[PDB]
Design a binder for these strands. Structure first.
Ligand code: MG
Ligand code: MG
Ligand code: MG
Ligand code: MG
Lengths: 80, 80, 90
RNA sequence: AUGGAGAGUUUGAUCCUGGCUCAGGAUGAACGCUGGCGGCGUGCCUAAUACAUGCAAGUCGAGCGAACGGACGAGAAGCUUGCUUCUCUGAUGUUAGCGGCGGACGGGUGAGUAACACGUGGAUAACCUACCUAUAAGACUGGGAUAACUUCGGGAAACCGGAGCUAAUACCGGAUAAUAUUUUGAACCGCAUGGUUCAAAAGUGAAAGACGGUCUUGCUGUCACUUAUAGAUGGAUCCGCGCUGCAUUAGCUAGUUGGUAAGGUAACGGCUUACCAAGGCAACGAUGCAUAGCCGACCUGAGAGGGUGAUCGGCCACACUGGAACUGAGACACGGUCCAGACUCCUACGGGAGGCAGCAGUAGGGAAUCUUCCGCAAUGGGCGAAAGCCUGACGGAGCAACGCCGCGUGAGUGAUGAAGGUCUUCGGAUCGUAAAACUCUGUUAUUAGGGAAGAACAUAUGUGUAAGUAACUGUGCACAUCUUGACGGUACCUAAUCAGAAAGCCACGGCUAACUACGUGCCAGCAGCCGCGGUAAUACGUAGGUGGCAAGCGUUAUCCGGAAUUAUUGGGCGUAAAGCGCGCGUAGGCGGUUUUUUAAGUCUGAUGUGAAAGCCCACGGCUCAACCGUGGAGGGUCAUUGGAAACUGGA
């Protein structure tokens, strides 16, 4: 095993933990926003805005691709 | 600007919904003996309105993939 | 990274370099983007040089960065001076 | 015009038909005998078998904290004023660690793959793209952690676990900002989907500092940073055409073919999933089976063609076998992760480590294929502002007649035809100008001196000049100066000495260049085919002589040729092999005369492209040649576009 390879293993694990935390958060927000839009709620716009914020912040963190974020935003804001 | 390939051929089956198969005929030459021999290739093209009917000579143009095997779109019915 | 560099030819103890635009990751003596000239460092006890100034300037403007030897060759041919003047007075 | 040879063999003899065999070229070759040198190449084709050992991927202190060392040089005198500690200041540096980038390149192999894999030509109004370059706007305001480090605990180790503290160009909240996303109005445009540009609202998306200059209560240079836009590079998908054997493989297919909706992906799409229909492929060969990386090219042939896919370059695929994702611009990742399986090694038995189809090397297999070398000096790559570090890529040595090419092993006079071998009609003939002797030369060899190019540089230092600045440093550029070579004191040149060290292989019946003697006696043996050998063998073995080659010469294996012996070029079927026993007929093939028209075939231009290297032509450079470089020429069944209308095709 190479030293740089072991370093990359460690950094990969750390980055994976952080990324999966953030991705789960954004997925939860998107699901909540989609449910709120499907069944009209007074919290609808705030939930959609939170979902869009997290989607774009994930896209900028590279967790999802920009085109994925664009599709999510398009469908969410067309539903709402 | 750039144009896409266009073919003219007869329709040989239209049992599919909104899809017509166009038979384009060509004459490849034998590489050794040099004789001209018939060559038929069936093209799966998109027929949005079911305008084309079994038998008519139609024109098709190349498009992006539209199905598993459909790669062409009907442009006009030259004859019938 | 696009680059203008020297690809080796000739024979053992008889090098002859061509000046080629190539991606940094491409092999030396392998895939190239476009050839621009030649560089013979064992001719008449004086390095023979040939370069196409138009292509060199076009690729430098596009973003290709020469190596050490190609930079020296372009300086000797004066391509670096014209490139710098054009960039400054653009 | 640049280009094309045949011969033996069936018969008592003949002509024909017909196979068989030989003369040629080639090789990643092997073997036998032999063996001087130099240049340029080439060298595990078998077991994608298993691998000991060493090495093949790091870098950045000008992102970050901490630690080692602790200069210059602080204090008492042990009276040792030259050695002393901690109470300091503490430089050039170095490093275990976090962090950035790299590690997806470079390199190996051809197992799998009959496929849009590859080649060629197109399309994407269905696409993604870090580092690089340019432009526009910014880089504001706050925060909580955690490595490192200290301490305890658990383990053989790998490594974990608890507690305490500490940074950032690590992470996170907030503000501002879009061509990004939604909505309503537009305008123009294309090839269905649609594309372009202009307005007005809503939601939402960033960032960082580092090292320096200055007139230092504030501006600024370089690098770094965020967003948007372009360019460039790289990647992805789709399509036309081309691209292999078998029918003693004829049926195949059910996510299969299409549609609607949804999900999914950079992206279109049955890519996936629900529902509706029964479609879709196939004798123009589907399905199945066998084999195979594809190509530029390479060998051969007068050509048409046939065969091949080493080295070198492009593309694809794979990394012990199979599956999967994470990180990342980029991987489902050769020297990364997880799981399963097979296999090695360590263990304290609880658990761990690993994968040469990287470079050497080992065992094994084989007829057979290299040394566990020197160096980053040249080219290239990774990081960095840079000096610089890493690089078995690469540049070079070692080994091998394995190939091609070049030069040797002496040159001149020498009849006196010496001696000796062989044959002989016993005259002589031949080895033979061969030898000897004389004269010369040093390729080459030996010794001694001189000794390249490959080296551009980068960096550093002075000078200027362009943008911007109030100015400055810096930035780019131009010109200058010192310094950098493993090969290697190698090539090469100069001077001296000696023909002295340096010739072998096959063949001699015809093909096919070269014949005599002795021995043997259908034995021993030879042989590519016809055949040769049973007592006077140009065919066996030896000898002399001769022929063909020469550091090689023969044998074997394989491909093409000769073979018109699968015949398009370019053959045939009364008796040599070959007309179905004969009808009726489907598909296919082909088709009478004239006129008009079309322009698919046909013919003729233009444009793009057919990488480089290679074949061929010319030129130039190594003393020549091989070899190397440059410029031409050619190679398409290629694609778009304009012309012609006799012929084939359509009307
Ligand atoms: Mg295979
Ligand atoms: Mg790797
Ligand atoms: Mg007969
Ligand atoms: Mg008959």
């Amino acid at each position: 095993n190479i030293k740089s390879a072991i370093k990359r293993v460690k950094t990969t694990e750390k980055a994976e933990a952080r990324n999966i935390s953030q991705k789960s958060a954004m997925r939860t927000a998107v699901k909540n926003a989609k449910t709120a839009v499907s069944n009209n709620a007074d919290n609808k716009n705030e939930l959609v805005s939170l979902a869009v914020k997290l989607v774009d912040k994930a896209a900028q963190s590279n967790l999802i691709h920009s085109n994925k974020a664009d599709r999510i935003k398009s469908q969410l804001m067309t539903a709402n | 600007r750039n144009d896409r390939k266009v073919y003219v051929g007869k329709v040989v089956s239209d049992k599919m919904d909104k899809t017509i198969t166009v038979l384009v005929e060509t004459y490849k030459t034998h590489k050794l003996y040099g004789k001209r021999v018939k060559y038929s290739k069936k093209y799966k093209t998109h027929d949005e309105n079911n305008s084309a009917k079994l038998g008519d000579i139609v024109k098709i143009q190349e498009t992006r993939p539209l199905s598993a095997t459909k790669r062409f779109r009907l442009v006009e019915i030259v004859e019938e | 990274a696009v680059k203008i560099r020297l690809t080796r030819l000739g024979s053992k103890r008889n090098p002859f370099y061509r000046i080629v635009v190539a991606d940094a990751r491409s092999p030396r003596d392998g895939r190239i983007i476009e050839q621009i000239g030649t560089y013979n460092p064992t001719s008449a006890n004086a390095p023979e040089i040939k370069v196409d100034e138009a292509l060199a300037l076009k690729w430098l403007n596009d973003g290709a960065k020469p190596t050490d030897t190609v930079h020296n060759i372009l300086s000797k041919e004066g391509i670096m001076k014209k490139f710098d003047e054009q960039k400054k007075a653009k």
